[PDB]
Amino acid sequence: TPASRYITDMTIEELSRDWFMLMPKQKVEGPLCIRIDQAIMDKNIMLKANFSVIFDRLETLILLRAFTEEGAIVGEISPLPSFPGHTIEDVKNAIGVLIGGLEANDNTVRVSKTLQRFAWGS
């Protein structure tokens, strides 16, 4: 896919950084894996993603991560190697799950400008 149709909210370093969970929680929602640190509470969180776009919409997610204001990664949506292929509907469903999980822990959750434009929001 052309560079103009590849969205990169995250830097190479942000994509590849290991991250940590004091109290890990995992949910497989269709062909996507959702993970959260249940110990993270009372924070403002931003969802950021790297993904292709076509016809004005998200096409294929590479990776989405949840960042605190301090820039710590506290959550993730990742495609599963065992299920190649997902749709924007799968992605939206996963985003709903991650947002629900983080908000249950009294966090306030925002999504990036590009995620809002290409996937999240009616």
HSE, side-chain direction, 13 A CA sphere, residue 19: 23
The strand pair at 57-68 and 44-54 is best described as: antiparallel
16-52 residues labelled b (16+ CB within 10 A) or e (exposed): eeeeebeeeeeeebebbbbbbbeebeebebbbbbbbe
Residue closest to 72 by CA, chosen among 48, 91, 55: 48
Map out the domains of the chain with their CATH numbers. 1-122 (3.30.420.330)
CB 105 within 8 A of CB 40: yes
The strand pair at 108-111 and 44-54 is best described as: parallel
Q: In angstroms, rounded to a whole number, what is the distance separating the alpha carbons of residues 1 and 6?
A: 7
Q: In angstroms, rounded to a whole number, what is the distance separating the alpha carbons of residues 6 and 58?
A: 9
Q: What is the resolution of this structure in A?
A: 2.2
Measured between alpha carbons, how far is residue 35 from residues 19, 57, 100 in Å? 11, 24, 12
Name 103's bridge partners.
none
Measured between alpha carbons, how far is residue 30 from residues 7, 43, 77 in Å? 23, 28, 12
Which residues in the chain belong to E strands, given as ranges? 6-8, 24-29, 32-37, 44-54, 57-68, 73-79, 108-111
Q: In angstroms, rounded to a whole number, what is the distance separating the alpha carbons of residues 117 and 122?
A: 10
